[PDB]
Amino acid sequence: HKIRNEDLIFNESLGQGTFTKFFKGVRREVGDYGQLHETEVLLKVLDKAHRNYSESFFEAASMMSKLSHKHLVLNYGVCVCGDENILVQEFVKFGSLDTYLKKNKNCINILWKLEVAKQLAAAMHFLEENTLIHGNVCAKNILLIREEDRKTGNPPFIKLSDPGISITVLPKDILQERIPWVPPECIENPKNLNLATDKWSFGTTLWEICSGGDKPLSALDSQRKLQFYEDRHQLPAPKAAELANLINNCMDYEPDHRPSFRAIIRDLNSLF
Template identity: 25%
Template sequence: MMENVGAQMRTSRDGTALVGTGADSSFALAQCYGDLSSDDCLRCFAEARTILPSCFPNNGGRIYLDGCYMRFQNYSFFDEYTGPDDTIVCGNTTRKSTPFQDTVRQAVSNAVTDSLRNKGYFAREDILVSGNGNTSVYVMAECWRTLIPDLCRACLMNASASITKCLPWSAGRALNTGCFMRYSDTNFLNPLTVKKKKNSHLSVILPIVFTVVVFSFALVVYAWRKKKKSHHKVAQVNKDQKQDSDLPFFSLNEVVKATRNFSIDNKLGQGGFGAVYKGVLEEGGEIAVKRLSKTSRQGLPEFQNEVTCIAKLQHRNLVKLLGCCVQGEEMMLIYEYMPNKSLDSFLFDKNNCMLLDWPQRYHIINGIARGLLYLHQDSRLRIIHRDLKASNILLDSNMNPKISDFGLARMFKEYETEANTNKVVGTLGYISPEYAANGLFSVKSDVFSFGVLVLEIVSGTKNRGFSHQSHHDNLLGHAWRLYKEAKPLELVDAALGDSWNVSEVLQSIHVGLSCVQQQADDRPYMSSVVHMLGGEGALPMPKQPGFFTDSALITPPHVSVSINEATLSQLDGR
């Protein structure tokens, strides 16, 4: 399907495709923004395609990059211009002056008008702020070309109304179903290229002939290098693992037999790494096999990272890595099998949530806290997980929680306390403000994610996508409101009935709010969290949480985030 779209992208910079019929239909759309060069357009499309597999097995997904857009669904969405997932992303919390804000509103209004006049529904604005000769406002807006003008206008009007809510901050994006809009005080607009007239047919023919010859030669070299690289990759993995004699090897034959040749009946799920299968060894032991997909965005670095991070870690609240299998192009991690799957399969399911009473939930909260404390303080190296969420908490046969999925984890040396990155990874709703806004991560980033998780466990509700009839806050904002109004017990999941302990619930809510405070320095360390959950030590008064509304998310220069468990990226333009 994407090959069809890609062929269209090479000539028209946008494309649509439909494969299958009836219930098995799949629809796809991709489009580059109007000021992107042809070469950059193809690069952006290629980047989006590498991200796409992480959306599976969901029946739809959207990828917004600061150069192009991609979407697929199991129904025709080509004339949709609005939807429940429309959102804004506000960046760089620098408060701007009133003249700047007025100029943003004017530029956004101009962009709406110009988009409808221009071919391709694209507009860009560059307006100098009145009274400030050094500051300009830059705006870009574009509709997907499958929309008719009236629907484009409606989408852009919605986007312009939403994006101005980012003011007085200096940057914002509107990620809408049928269009994209962005403003900033930094020039992100791509330089417009002027096409030069060719003087002769020869000037066209010669580059084509030369390109064909070079391309043919490059294909031969690429095929040879890929084969060589494949052997080198396997050799390198084997070399690294031989240095770690504590990690057992499983033969491909063992794994194939255990999983019944990767039978669909044995498949437990699908993630960014690839598919996960249940297996039964010859001696009867049950295992979970994470098989690296050949189209996975993760690959060798994340495979090695996961092995390095948890190969020698031993804690009852961390999933145990039993070994690995590397043979040919196959790369697999072998874990202990968790019969109760992940926490989210209980917590957010209207039927299964009834099986999770309060003593079990409190036990899970404490177990996750102890596992994080081990990672942050008691293991050989300080490890920051960076993607703590309900779907990464596995449950064994006794409902003991196990922290899993260390592909995005980072290891710190003893003297290191924090680090900075220009590529933020994680899941929307769980990422801390300082990490999302500035790429700064530390143990306090995991503490924020833990706090979100605690409030989700108490309420039985996801933070991301939470809705309430009387306000527009997310779960963190709702919990904060109830806390300030001295009604925190109203947060408790109705599915718990009367099984909950008042003091434990209040303790959990208090700890959860303490962990999601806006400033990292205000959040407790996990050692304090464990003490507070155990009834030891004072409970400090929490301050306002970070990201307490979904409409005020912050984005850094390059952020990879997850929506509905599918990792997406946003890349800043030049």
């Protein structure tokens, strides 16, 4: 799915990721019978001309877009927009989950958090079955498509976004900043990227969800984050500690001891 630079209209900036800038935009395309179709899109732009990153940046989105699952983000295509590398993605009204959590943690309850966790686990189980590694599971990379509306019996609806640049090519300084989302074995060797990687990160993301969007270890510097792993610290149990044991099971320093997503789904459904 290749798109032209002329077809893309940049609107307001909407934050950034690792070596990436986000913008609200409009995708313009000519249809048959002279029709003009405009689509509200999120534009993910790679800073400068990062060549090795662009390949990793796009290789990740491409592999995931080849698959179809209702809790995975929809990518429309890419633009080698001259001096820009752009991923064109569906626009989500309510933004990322971490921002939504910190603003609504007052009116979010155990059931809301369990449903959202199940949808994520369903997406991760689907990726596990297809042996596809995400590598950057975090609340910031979860998108809220729909708010809860019990009046109409509608649950919240989230989607897992793209990984971005792979942690196998990023500067180790960046990986250390992403502790405790980047699992320990990837801090010692970024070639340890495995299916077990995403199970750890899912645990950290569950901690975010239970903690109302608090970012674990965000106050610490990179050296204390490293020491956190060197001494095999675990994150403390959230106030809403209904998922503490599952978080601990997922954040196991031994990759082989992390539960399958089939089992994570079992543990989540049992709480209901």
